[model samples]
Target: KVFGRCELAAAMKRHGLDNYRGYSLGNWVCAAKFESNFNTQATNRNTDGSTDYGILQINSRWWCNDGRTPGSRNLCNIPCSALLSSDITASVNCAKKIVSDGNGMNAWVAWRNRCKGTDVQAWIRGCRL
Candidate 1:
């Protein structure tokens, strides 16, 4: 499902992403905006035969297991399909795990290039949360 910006913010907040691992809710909001345009079913295939799955585009090369990505570590220990689920708990939890491993929000290139050091709050300024 494609999310409205505010809806994405509220959903992430409910799943505990608000300031999780020192990355604010807006950080995620911005990342999602640029990475997937708030589309939960978004995906991208890297040139290395790995696929990025779901909202934040969690990559199969290092994060989830797509049963196809060569040398995948499956660091999130989850099936890649789970990241595309409408219920974002798996995607959110996987994102938290990625950060907990010290990757920070830089794991997503879009986040690093667009959200890093930016005023992310504007991404969700109209959100009630």
Candidate 2:
């Protein structure tokens, strides 16, 4: 795993993600937790045969190429394995682009189902950043 909640918050802050494109740090943290439990190497196969990658769980259908998924837009222009690394720079950058594309955090189903409409303060409660 790349980060715990507090460490992840610190990292996110360092990357200027405390409030990137109008999304809050808490929202990112909450989504990361629910998506992959902060595991950077986490990958999940969806019922639709699309795969989600990394802590952000970016989908292969639009963001990255997973080899098995065809017709991937590869909007991030990165390989899916790059997102599975402990170094989250690529994943973070891709996530920023995703939100900047106007999806907000709603691009992440974990955020939509679990973090959205909830008080997410606890995601950063004790994090210094």
Candidate 3:
């Protein structure tokens, strides 16, 4: 849901997956689910007042340390520099890579099931996604 129609397709193409494919969508949804419960504007404060933001929950301290401009954690919108940047892609890719190594999407199969079983929106729906 991050990217619009063509943007989504383009992103998936770059990532070597079908944009509309169920499993691919499932994984995308799952990341949003586990990371920030699909709250594109979410923010979480750390003990030192740093924050993690966006659907993928990119950490503000890490963002600044990595040379990304520090903004409110709410800046984690789709295609945000902190979440899907070439710089941050490694972390996101690592999550998908680990899941794909052994039976690919099987590790996240439960997410699909959870998504299918829910009608609640917001956090509850995100949990299933």
Candidate 4:
């Protein structure tokens, strides 16, 4: 029930599946659950706010313009207020763009590495695993 989206849009976002075909939604879910325990509100402060909240655990600064917003409270890295305006499909799709823009998993990938991991096998399985 990550963020009440049932299927967990953050999982789709984490695996960079915003633009993925519907056929791959299941697989992406599996990977997302394995990565973040299917917790949309999950947070990892150890990454210096890099791996903070949501199903994908997107950093607080990356999604919210105001880092001190509602969702930025320790383990509750994302504010419910922000989640209200934040749509899972829309957010995941945006992340797909970011991931494909020569960033790969990080913001330092070379041009050739760009979007290389966008084709996640987990998304292909549709969480059946």
Candidate 5:
């Protein structure tokens, strides 16, 4: 399921992502916008034969066991398909694990190149709370 901007923000907030790991809600919102355009079923194939899955683009090689990524860490211990679900609970959980592993928001290139080092509050302008 695709999410409206405010709808996505509300979901993240409800999942305790606001100001998570020193990253603002806007940072998460900004990354999600660029990463998947709020589409839950998004996926990207990597040249290294890995795949990034779901709205937050959790990668197959490191986070989830896609069965295709040999020797995958499967760090989240979840199927890559779990991240593709519209509910987003698994996506949010996996994302927290990624950040907790010390990767920070920079793990996502979309966040690094686009949302980093900027006052990202504009990303959530007019979307109070």
Candidate 6:
């Protein structure tokens, strides 16, 4: 499922992600835009031969298993395919775990490279809750 910025923001807010784990919703929105463009089914193969999955692009190398990427730590203990689902519950939960582990949004290169230190309020502009 693909989401417009507002729809995505609403969903994230509904999920209590506006201030989840001490990260701002704007940061999450910015990272998701850069990472997957709000496409829940988005996936990409990294140079290291691992794949990124879903809206936040959770990586196979450290988070979930794609079944093709051997030696995955599978720290989230979920199949990478789970992140591709329209229901983002598992993805959000795994993301929370990733952030709580002290990686924060740095877990996503998109956030570090693009969203970090930027005035990300535009990501939630006019969303009004």
**Model number with the top lDDT:** 5
lDDT of each: 0.90, 0.89, 0.44, 0.44, 0.91, 0.90
lDDT tens digits, residues 1-129, model 1?
A: 899989989999999999998888999989988999888889898899999999989999898998998888998999999989899999999888888887798888999998899889898898899
Query: Cα lDDT of model 6 overall?
Result: 0.90
Residue pairs clashing, model 3: none
By descending TM-score, how would the candidates be arranged? Answer: 5, 1, 6, 2, 4, 3
**Residues 1-129, candidate 2, lDDT per residue (tens digit)?**
668889988898888798788778999999999999999999889888899999999999999998888867999999999999888899999999898887788888889999998998789998777
lDDT (Cα) of model 4: 0.44
Runs of candidate 5 with Cα error greater than 4 angstroms are none
lDDT of 5 by residue, 1-129 (tens): 999888889889999999988889989989999999999999999899899998899998899998998868998999999999889999999899898787799899999999898888877787858
In model 5, the Cα lDDT at residue 123 comes to: 76
Off by over 4 Å in 1: none
Cα lDDT, model 6, residue 19: 88
- Give the Cα-based TM-score of candidate 3 against the true structure: 0.35
- Mind giving the per-residue lDDT tens digits that candidate 4 earns over 16-126? 564454325544344445545665545555444344444444445455333453334333234423432334554454445444555444532221243234554534443
Q: Report the error of model 3 at residue 127, Å.
A: 17
- Quote model 6's TM-score: 0.94
Cα error of candidate 3 at position 87, Å: 17
| TM match of model 1 to true structure | 0.95
TM-score of each: 0.95, 0.94, 0.35, 0.46, 0.96, 0.94
| Per-candidate clashes, comma-separated | 0, 0, 0, 16, 0, 0
lDDT (C-alpha) at residue 2 in model 5? 94
Question: Any idea how many clashes model 3 has?
Answer: 0
Model 4 scores a TM of 0.46
lDDT of 6 by residue, 19-108 (tens): 888778898889999999999999998888899999999999999988888867999999999999998888988998888898788978
Residue 107 miss distance in model 4 (angstroms): 6.7
